[model samples]
Target: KTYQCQYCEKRFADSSNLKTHIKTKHSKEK
Candidate 1:
């Protein structure tokens, strides 16, 4: 299974990694 970002098309192999990505990358928002 894969986890996708709520704000972008990026997908992660693990949900935890996806959460980390969102928290660090997209936390700033558009």
Candidate 2:
């Protein structure tokens, strides 16, 4: 499966980087 970003519409070939994007970008959301 491919990993994608919802906010910036960025695409990542690695799941780890997708996860990093979420963690870095959405970590403070309630």
Candidate 3:
């Protein structure tokens, strides 16, 4: 099974990683 990011539809191995990914990749001001 895989976890996907609703922000960009990226898949992760687990929720923790996904959360961090969102915080790191999408949550920040660009």
Candidate 4:
């Protein structure tokens, strides 16, 4: 599965890695 970042409008092929990205990149928003 893949993910799509609504905020940055980015695309990811790995969902697990994407979660880490949301943590590291979107921590302030989360």
Could you tell which candidate, 2 or 4, scores higher by lDDT? 2
Judged by lDDT against the true structure, how good is candidate 1? Answer: 0.79
The residue-by-residue lDDT of candidate 3 on 1-30, one tens digit each, is 888988887899988888789878796656
The root-mean-square deviation over C-alpha atoms between each candidate and the true structure, in angstroms, is: 2.0, 3.0, 1.4, 2.7
Candidates sorted on lDDT, descending: 3, 2, 1, 4
Candidate 4 RMSD to the real structure:
2.7
lDDT score of model 3?
A: 0.83
Cα misplacement distance, residue 6 of candidate 1 (Å): 1.7
- Higher-scoring candidate on TM-score, 1 or 4: 1
Which one wins by lDDT: 1 or 2? 2
* C-alpha TM-scores of all predictions: 0.60, 0.45, 0.65, 0.46
For model 3, what is the error of residue 24's alpha carbon versus the real structure, in angstroms, after optimal superposition? 1.4
lDDT by residue (tens digit), candidate 2, 1-30: 888887777889998888788877788773
Ten consecutive residues with minimal summed lDDT in candidate 1? 21-30
Computed on alpha carbons, the lDDT of every model, listed in order, comes to: 0.79, 0.81, 0.83, 0.74
